[PDB]
Structures are given as C-alpha cells and as structure tokens.
Design an enzyme around this catalytic site. Structure first.
Site, PDB file in Angstrom:
ATOM      1  N   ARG A  28       0.733  -1.088   0.042  1.00  0.00           N
ATOM      2  CA  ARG A  28       0.143  -0.031   0.042  1.00  0.00           C
ATOM      3  C   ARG A  28       0.950   1.256   0.238  1.00  0.00           C
ATOM      4  NH1 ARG A  28      -5.772  -0.478  -0.473  1.00  0.00           N
ATOM      5  NH2 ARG A  28      -6.468  -2.546   0.856  1.00  0.00           N
ATOM      6  N   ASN A  65      37.077  28.195 -16.692  1.00  0.00           N
ATOM      7  CA  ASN A  65      38.179  27.436 -17.183  1.00  0.00           C
ATOM      8  C   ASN A  65      38.117  27.507 -18.747  1.00  0.00           C
ATOM      9  OD1 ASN A  65      39.622  25.557 -15.198  1.00  0.00           O
ATOM     10  ND2 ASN A  65      37.632  25.658 -14.478  1.00  0.00           N
ATOM     11  N   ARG A  87      28.187  25.431  -1.961  1.00  0.00           N
ATOM     12  CA  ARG A  87      28.329  24.284  -2.540  1.00  0.00           C
ATOM     13  C   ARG A  87      29.476  23.386  -1.730  1.00  0.00           C
ATOM     14  NH1 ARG A  87      28.642  24.094  -8.718  1.00  0.00           N
ATOM     15  NH2 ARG A  87      28.764  22.175  -8.263  1.00  0.00           N
ATOM     16  N   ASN A 130       1.954   1.608   7.257  1.00  0.00           N
ATOM     17  CA  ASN A 130       1.290   0.707   6.181  1.00  0.00           C
ATOM     18  C   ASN A 130       1.289   1.335   4.695  1.00  0.00           C
ATOM     19  OD1 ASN A 130       1.431  -1.544   7.824  1.00  0.00           O
ATOM     20  ND2 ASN A 130      -0.529  -1.258   8.379  1.00  0.00           N
TER      21      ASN A 130
END
Ligand code: P21
Ligand code: P21
Ligand code: P21
Ligand code: MG
Ligand code: MG
Lengths: 450, 450, 450
Positions: free
Chosen positions: A15, A383, A330, A224
C-alpha cells in the site's frame, strides 16, 4: 543480563505503491528500520537480528553498514515464524526484545521499562490504551499479570470495553523463546504462526506475563502507507523541535521546522520558519537562520547571520560572517570569520579569507581568496575548454572589479587591483593594477525607435 | 432517471469586503461556484441552472465557458424564490438537486446517496449532525421519514437536544418542485420564501421526505467571509494531499503542500515541504521536488530532480534532467533528457538539447540549443534596440565561454567554441573558435588605498 | 477614575537558557514585556511601573524608549514585595492593575472588564477556568464574591473539583494596595510575600473581592521556556491572521503567515503561503503577494503583484508595478508606477522611473533611473577602488545593453543607447549611441576535445 533484539523487516509494503520494501521508506531522512536499529543499539543490544525478505537487494545496499545479523526469510508465515528464524542465535540467558521495522517511533525509555518489568522465566508485554480498541486484542489482567489476549471476535460484552490492547512488542529470555516458539501453531483464520500466542504458552507453563503500557500511542504506530508515514514524520519532527526548544533554541514555528540528522547548538540560536537542517550540522552561539534556509552538513561559527533563502552544503562558516539572502554554498566552501556572501552568489570548493566580501551575482569555484578582498558584482571564475578544472588563487587585499572573468589557472598576488570588465588570463603581480582599454564608437543624434 | 442541478450563486458576500461577488472567491485556484458546477457535472447533470445576481458582469467573465443556464435574478426574496426562477426549465420527470455556490466541498458520493434515497414523488433532504445544533432547524423523524424541520425558536426542551439539522440541500422531481414552489409563502420574521418549507408542503401532500446524513460537517459548510474560506481551503488541500499519499506520492508534510489544479504522477514521487502545484502538472516515476518549488502547467519526465526554490511554468523537462536550486523556467522552456539547469538561471521560450548544461547566472531566451552544449556562467542572449525579439540558434557540441553575450539574431554551428567575455553578433561556423582580443594596461607599484 | 499599571519583569528566565532576561524574548518581533506595556498604554494607564532586575542593562538598552517608571528591584522576595517597590508612586485614588511581563497575550478587553468590575475599596481578581486545575489556587465564591483562594495542598474533596483558579492579575485602588501590601507576610513553604494574600486581607477588612473570568486560557499564559514561547507566538499569529481575514485580506493559509509589526491594507489583497510581513507595511488595493515573500518596512501601491521569493526592505513601490520572482529591494529602493523588476535583480538606494524595466541578473545601486528605460540583463552599477561610493544618473528613455557596467560617478542623458558588453566611464549625451568595438580572433578548423 545481556540483551539482543529481533527486528521484523521483511514486508513488501504493498500500500506504499513503491519499488522499495516497506521499511526503507524514510522518517527524518533515514529508513524506518534504521530508527529501530539505532534504538536497539542505544538499549545496549549485543546482537540485532534483522528479519528481511522482500526487496532483499535494496535492503542490503541501503543498510550495508548496519551492525545486524542478516536473517533472510524465504516465506512470511507469521510473526512467530519470523522470530524463530533468528532463534538459533539467541543465547539462553540473554533477554530478547522483538521490534517492528515499520514502527520507528518506539522509545528507548519505554523499552527500558519493558525490559526491567520482565519477570524471571516470564514475558514483559508492551500494551497500549486506545479510546476505540475495536479490532485489537484485549489485555485480560488477573492480579497484575496478563492471563490472556482476547481478540475482537471472541470478546464478551465487558471485555470489549477494555481499552488496553496488545502491541506485539515483548521481551523474554532466549531459552524461553526457543521453547515456546516451537509450540506455536497456525490453527486460526489466517493460517499464520502468531508471536501473540507466546502469552498463552507462557501461562500454560505457569510463567508470569506482565504488561507495560506505552506512554504514547504514536510510539507504537507502524506505517502501512504514506499517509501514515507522514503522520509519523510530523510527530517525530514536532518531538525533535520540542526537545530543541526546551534546550534553548528559538524555533519560531516548530510546525515549520525540519531536522533530518543531528544538530549541535550553542546558546541563543534563532531559527525562523521553514528551515531544513540535514546531515550533521553544528551552530555556534547566537547564530540566526532566516526563513527558507537549507543547511546540510555544515559548521557555522558564533554570531553568524544567514539571511533568507540561502542553501549551504558541506561548508564551514567562520564567526561573525554574514551570508544571504539567496546565497549558495556548495561542497567545500570554507568562509573565514567576518566574511560577507550576498545575493545570487555561488561558492564551490573555495576558501575565502577573513573580512573578504562576495556580495552579488558571482560564481567562485575552485578558488583560494585571501583576507580583505573585494570581489565585485558579476565576477566569474572559469576554465578553458579543456579536460580537468583548475584553480584561481587570489592573495590578500585584492580588489576585483565588477564583471571580470578570472580564467583558471591563474594567480593574483597581494594588493592587486583589477578594473571592471576585465578578462584575467595571465598572473597578476603584487600591487599591480590591470585595467581594460576599451574601444568605443560614439554616434551622436541617434534617435531611438520612439 | 435524468438529473439537473440548480446552483444558488446570487449573493453579494458583504463580509468578504470585496469587489467580487461571493461565489467567485477561489478554493485551490478556482471559484467556489466552479467546484459546485464540476460536482454537478460529475453526478451526470443534464442541465445546470445557475441563479446569479450580484456582480453579474464578473460572473459572466469569470465563468464564461461554463455549461450552465444563466438565470439572472433581479431580487433576492429567499431560496424558494431563487429555485423558482429556474423551475420553468425543469423536466417533469427528471430529478433536481439544489446546491449552494458558496459550499464548494459537497461530494459526489454524498449527493449520489441523496439522489438514490429520494422516494417516488417525495424529497431526499441532506442533513448534518452537530455537537452544538443551537440556531439550526432540527430534523424530526417519525419512522424513517422527516415530518418537520423545527427552528430553534420553536423547539421544545427535548427537540433542542436533537443534533441532526437541516442543510437546505435536497432532491426532488421537477414536477413536484413546480407544484410546491408555487405554494411557498413568506409569512415569517424575515419575510422570505424559504426552500425549507417544501418539507412541510410535501408532508401536507402525503409525500415522503427521507433524510440522508452528510458524512462530514465540512462537506456542507459555506464561506461567508475569508476566515471561513481559508478553513475550506485548508480542509480541501488536506483531503487532496491525503488522496495523493494513499496513491503512493510521498508528500513530506501534507499541511505544507498546495495543489491548485490536477496532478498526474508516476511511482515513487517525492515532494518536499512548501511546494505549490498549479494548473495541469504531470510528474513521471521517481521525480523528486525540493522545498519551495512552484510548478505551473509543466510536464516532468522520469527520474528528474528539481532542487529547492525553483519556479517552472508552461515547460517540459525530459527524463533524468536536473533543475535548480534557484532555477527559473518561463513559458515555452523545453529541456531535453539529461539536461542541467542551475542556480540563478532563467530560460524562456527556448529548447535545450540532450546533455546540455546551463548551470549559473545566465539568461537564455528565444533560443534553440542543441545537444551536449556547455553554456558558461554569465552568458546572456540579448537583442538590439529594435522592434521584435529575434532567435539565437546554437548547434550541437558548442562551448560558450563565461560572460559572453549572444546578440540575436545569430547562429552558432556545431562544434564551435566561444571564449569568455565575447560579444557574438555574427554567425559562427562549424568548428570555429572565436576568442576576444583584449587590450589591457598594466600599472606596476599601484598601492591600494590601504 | 485614573489608572496606572505595575508590570512584573525582573525574572532571570533560567529555563530559556539565554543571556537575555526572561521578558526580552520576542513575540511577533517585539519583547514580551513590550506587548504588556502597549496594552497598559491602550487601557489608558497614566503611569507604568516596570519592576525589573535580572539583565538590567539589557532591559534598559532594549526598552530605552518606553514610557515607564524604572523600578530596580535588588532581590526577588515574592510578587507582593515586587508590587510594593512601586507602591510609593501609587496615587491614593487611582486604580492600579498588576500585570506580568512574561504573559504578553492579555487583552485590553479582558482588562477593561476587570477594571469595571472592581467594587469601591475592593479588588477585581482575574480568574481562569481549567479542565485540569491541579496545582492551582481554587476560587471559592460565596454569593458573587471571592472569599478565599485555596491552594492545591489545602483543598478538600469538593474544592479540588473547582475549575476556576487564580491568575494573580488584579485591580485595586492605590490606597488599598499601600495598606494591604504592608500586611503581607511570608509565612509559607517558599518564604515569599505573595500578592495573592491581598484577597485574604481584603476579606479581613470587609472589602469585596469580585472575580472576572478570562475568555481564553492563552490570554493569561506566561512563557517560562521557549517551547511555551513558541505556543504563544503561534496563538498570536493565528489571532492576527484571523483579524486580517475578517477585514477582507485573503490569506491563503493563516498557519503559514507571519506579521511582526503592523499591516495597513486596501481591499482584495491576496497573500499566498509563507509570507512574512515585518515593521510597518502598507499594501494598496488588489496587491498580490506570492509565496515566500518577505516585506519589511515597505509601501506598496494599488495593483502591484509581487511574485514568489522576493525580499523587500525600506522600499516604496508605485501602482501597477510588477516585482519578482527572486527580486531583492534593499533600503532606499523607490520604484515608480508601472515598473518591472525581475529575477536575480538587486536594487539598493535607487529611484527607478515610470515604466522602466530591470528584468534580469542586475545590480543597481546608488542610482537614479528615469522613465521608460530598458536596463538589460547583466547590467551592473559599480565604483572605482576609492573611498565613498558615487551615483549613476540615467535619464528618460535610455536603453542600456546587456552586460554593461556603469562606473559611477556617471550620467547618461535622455534617449541614449548603450550597446551590450560596454564599460561606461564617461558621461553619455542626449541621443548618443555608444557601442563597443570588439577585436576577435577567428580560428577555423578548431576541433573540440570530443
Ligand atoms: C480501522 O482503522 C485502522 C487505522 C487506524 N489508524 C491509523 O490509520 C493510523 C495508523 C498509523 C498512524 Cl502513524 C496514524 C494513523 C490508527 C488509529 C489509532 C490507533 N492505531 C493503532 C494503535 C496500535 C499500534 C500498534 C499495535 C496496536 C495498536 C491505528
Ligand atoms: C454562531 O456561530 C456561527 C459560525 C459557526 N461556524 C463557522 O464559523 C464556520 C463556518 C464555515 C467554516 Cl468552513 C468553518 C467555520 C460553523 C461551526 C460548525 C457548524 N457550522 C454550520 C454547519 C452547517 C452547514 C450547513 C448547513 C447547516 C449547518 C458553522
Ligand atoms: C504541570 O504542567 C505545567 C505546564 C502546563 N502548561 C504549559 O506547559 C503551557 C504553558 C504556557 C503555554 Cl503558552 C502553553 C503551555 C499549561 C497547561 C494549561 C494551563 N496552563 C496554566 C494556565 C494559567 C495561567 C496563568 C495563571 C494560572 C493558570 C499551563
Ligand atoms: Mg556579466
Ligand atoms: Mg561582461
């Protein structure tokens, strides 16, 4: 005496409508079963026998590091059958506690009382009082001992009014489990071997069964489906928030606070609404976190203010720093004391030295920035179109003019000054001023389309 | 037999303190009356007679596309008078259900039971049980039939303890409505023609009135003010969230989830706290939506992760894409599979091909970008100061260096490379590298004001 | 007759685990004690005697501007002793109300009833009905007068079932306070002088004590810890939200709304979930505020839409403007009518004239921008590396091309056009077009690492 645990965790959880097995669904960022493993460990369990089955490969990948005995059950034939899979490993003279992997809120404290209540050669049974006990096995007490668990369909008029019911959680010694589990039958409507039947078997043997009541219904509830799971989540988060409030953390609204990990805190910390704390987070004294912030695996020093809608991960922030709003740290961002990071700024795998400011519309990645630098709006580290991604090294007391690109690998020495709109590809020396020479065309009398 | 509906929707809604009429205030993004129209349609109503009045022009503009009979009532003289405005259009042998435009939570299921319960030539009356029924008309049952509705001021001691009360919602055949509505008087303290009086009239005619109890009080509640409206909104959102949880959607907190439209979902979808879903949204399998996201009219493919504080509208996102945090998709954004859109990025009316990345501080508008492109930080598509706004076409495998402006209309062919800081006004050919030649002045021994 | 107040505010608040004294903790952005001072002022108090002690220096700094008599108590010896510190300043023929600085929710309305109920030469005592009164002093009524307050440990069987209990809030005349406070003893288990004992003393004197019941338990609750404080905060915010809803403000979810100051509003204002309003905020007619917005000290004109995740402080916004999402207005931002400010835009101490647009990835600081300007994406106002920060002046009908830096101090006259990628250091004349002459190197046959 010693203790070991058995955790029932084999279910499909149909479920949930999931590719995961039932007990891998998370509460506060960790599988339900991991909550129960941890509680068992905190109780002092020597062994933890994990009865598993459905989603076996996922269980092994998601819980690979757990200190459990993996007991692979090939068929679900009832709870007594499940416990009996682990029974060959029970020590005769240790206590065994049986727990459900889909009931993550059970407390150490309730279980300690349960264990302490167990009489020699007997059983301690965990019960719970319900206002509507319809459908559940009623606890029949004669003296202070449980003589029967009477199911709904068998109970007489007076028994139906009993509010105390069976949870299926229980403690007994290993030798008693081995003996009684071998005597459990499956002569019932479900054709299952129920652990519940141990109470009848203990009473058959003139052994004592004592009840201990759970303090909270939610403590013993299982999930459940995901609606029930969300109920557990909310109860858990409220309890966590309440603990932190009582420790002196000002959580403006505990209903809009989420902790999915651990929080270490100083004094006078203030956390505004809709903050999420994940992983291992440490906040110093007088840290203020504004609305909508997300902090995952971060250390924040004393007197830091994080302004709204800032997202920080795997980062360290020094004392008296100011972050946000709309700041992004980050992994590998390390901000020194008295730093300033502002709106629409992203810092990734970079160190920023004391007193430096990065206040607008900037990306700093793979960089070392020294102390008292001024990183202008619109600055970007980038870069070449190459293979790997190289480092930008900025010394102390450097001014970087707005909308400048720093093209790694490059070094800018102490005291350098870079004009706005510059493209820096070559190293800049100490006290070197670099300014871009623009060529412009000026056209007079240009009448705009207006 | 056939069914038609009458919806009472003429009210001023004075206590809303609004320029809108009462029933145009929204629940889950749509007017209360639209909820009731939809429920009537789902029941199988052949005609829906909309009794309207106050804010007539606004009703017509906001509900212009609704399949209703517009019955403009010039004066409010009571609910029986309102229903009688529609009565000339009732078929003699169809059932008619009377509903209130300010009670949007009434369920199809309750109304189906109401209709099924209606005896031939009689009435089915919807009732509700209140713990405090003070002020409401008490239902008097003799046998299983309603013989009277006794108002508060008339009830004796025992009648006042009756908890079952009248809601005013009822079903009867069209011919019975035509007959009885013509017999309703206004001899009461309010001088109004009450639909309620049909019960007395039916009993006068030896016709049967049967009661059907609402399952939920909230089901029959109306909103007279915005406090009540917010109560309806919260109940509705909770019910929607509960349905989705039971279908297998993991909503971390159903109290901090809003759906204002329809949600189609796969399996194992996870939605974090404070997400708003608006319009028609489709989420594939294993989609994860982070905190604070807003999705309006979007299709999201399998295995997409949307990180926190992303706002997406009228957009499509391919499988295994990664969006956010702090990403903005504006109408017409189409992201292919395996794309990456990052912080402080805005994409508007543009297609972005498979594997391409747009990860920072960028605006892409009116553009086609191919597969495996690298769009650097700070890149902006822009236009000349002109009239209309033209298109930027970027091929496959293109590298666009950071802080470059792409000046539409322009085409960049497959495999091209653009250096950082460039202004692209002319088309770039296949495998063409374009780099900006900067002129810089370097001044040594420039001692900063420090 | 006249009124003065005594506010008890000396406590350490140990269980807050704070460097602040108890009553300086905030509810809705202001110290608990400030709520009580304001309520006392609204009742018409001539003097407010603030009994303080712990955290004395912090009390004086945080409440420096409050019109109170500072009564520095050197030792806490009970509530009667605290009130007696102020008693030399009571006028014989004024009423005195005693209030607690850690019980901020007490209402003007309840206190007006309390004052009106006070009999000549007697006391009005505020009481509260509890479902579980265990631990609290029971109110004993004979006729309609309070003859005793019986503590838990003294009460007989029938008295223990009394639900009405003492709050310690009371009103009496100044002369009666002076007389009775001098007769309070400390012969009890705590060795304290309890204000409570005034009831016994009044009855000893054949003076009448009348009870007035609080309408709400929360009204009289104090906060001893931050969990209780958060309960007060939530109740307060709900009440504020409910008032605004009933005035006609559409607050989509009152449980996810925070007001920390004052809100002036027009008609048909809509506020989505998770909005925080701080300081003094004025919203005109038909203002719509999207989810996650933070508004502090702002004036917003009619028909403005603020889209999600916008943060505005000390700013003014003209009618029909559109702000957000992800917009940042910092102090001194003044946007004229019909302006547009978009995502990832920061405006600080700048005026922006009618119809102008600043829609992406831009910083405008210390600037004047005229009417109908177009400020392109990526535009930044900046300064030289100098001392103070100078102004950018942009006239009417100016086009500023994307990714341009405006280097203050600089003036751009009416009708000027600036090409993308430009660095503006010199003043631009009326109808002058300035475009950057780029030098590019084009390399054909550059095969990317692929
Ligand atoms: C027919 O309604 C079924 C469903 C009824 N229930 C639920 O749906 C429910 C289940 C789990 C949660 Cl967390 C919240 C609600 C609750 C209602 C309250 C009592 N408990 C059971 C308590 C219990 C736990 C363990 C062992 C024994 C009893 C089930
Ligand atoms: C004096 O208090 C008035 C106001 C009392 N009430 C409200 O303010 C209320 C009204 C609507 C909502 Cl959604 C929530 C609360 C509720 C209190 C609970 C019962 N219902 C009425 C139920 C009903 C609905 C339709 C027909 C008959 C009865 C009104
Ligand atoms: C043992 O439980 C202690 C703690 C019990 N209580 C609290 O923890 C509590 C205290 C404050 C808040 Cl805001 C919310 C809860 C409440 C429980 C409800 C009744 N009140 C007291 C009401 C009152 C206020 C002023 C004077 C007299 C009575 C205390
Ligand atoms: Mg730029
Ligand atoms: Mg540039």
């Amino acid at each position: 005496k010693a203790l070991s645990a058995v955790i029932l965790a084999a279910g499909k959880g149909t479920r949930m409508y999931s590719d995961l097995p039932k007990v891998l669904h998370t509460i506060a960022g960790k599988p339900m079963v991991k909550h129960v493993i941890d509680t068992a460990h905190q109780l002092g369990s020597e062994n933890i026998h994990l009865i598993y089955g459905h989603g076996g490969d996922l269980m092994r990948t998601h819980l690979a590091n757990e200190q459990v005995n993996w007991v692979l059950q090939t068929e679900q034939l009832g709870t007594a059958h499940a416990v009996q899979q682990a029974a060959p490993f029970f020590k005769d003279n240790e206590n065994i506690v049986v727990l459900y992997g889909d009931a993550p809120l059970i407390t150490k404290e309730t279980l300690e009382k349960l264990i302490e209540a167990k009489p020699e050669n007997g059983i301690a049974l965990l019960t719970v009082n319900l206002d509507n006990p319809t459908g559940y096995g009623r606890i029949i007490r004669e003296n202070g001992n449980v003589v029967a668990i009477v199911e709904q369909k068998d109970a007489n008029a007076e028994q139906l009014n009993i509010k105390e019911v069976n949870t299926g959680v229980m403690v007994s010694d290993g030798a008693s489990f081995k003996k009684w589990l071998a005597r459990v039958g499956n002569n019932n409507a479900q054709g299952e071997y129920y652990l519940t039947d141990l109470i009848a078997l203990a009473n058959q043997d003139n052994c004592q069964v004592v009840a201990v009541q759970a303090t909270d219904v939610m403590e013993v509830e299982g999930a459940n489906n995901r609606l029930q799971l969300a109920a557990l989540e909310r109860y858990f988060q409220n309890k966590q928030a309440s603990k932190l409030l009582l420790e002196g953390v000002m959580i403006y609204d505990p209903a809009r606070f989420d902790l999915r990990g651990t929080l270490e805190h100083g004094k006078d910390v203030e956390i505004d609404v809709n903050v999420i704390i994940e992983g291992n987070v440490k906040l110093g004294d007088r840290v203020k976190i504004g609305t909508g912030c997300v902090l995952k695996n971060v250390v924040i020093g004393n007197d830091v203010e994080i302004k709204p809608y800032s997202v920080l991960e795997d980062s360290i922030v020094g004392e008296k720093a100011a972050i946000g709003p709309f700041s992004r740290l980050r992994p590998g961002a390390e901000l020194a004391a008295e730093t300033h990071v502002g709106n629409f700024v992203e810092i990734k795998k970079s160190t920023v030295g004391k007193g430096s400011k990065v206040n607008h519309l900037t990306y700093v990645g793979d960089s070392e920035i020294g102390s008292n630098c001024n990183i202008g709006a619109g600055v970007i580290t980038c870069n070449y179109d190459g293979a790997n991604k190289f480092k930008t090294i900025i010394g102390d007391d450097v001014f970087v003019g707005s909308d400048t690109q720093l093209v790694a690998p490059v070094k800018v020495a102490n005291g350098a000054t870079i004009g706005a709109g510059t493209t820096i590809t070559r190293d800049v020396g100490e006290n070197e001023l670099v300014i871009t020479r623009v060529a412009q065309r000026h056209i007079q009398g240009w009448q705009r389309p207006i």
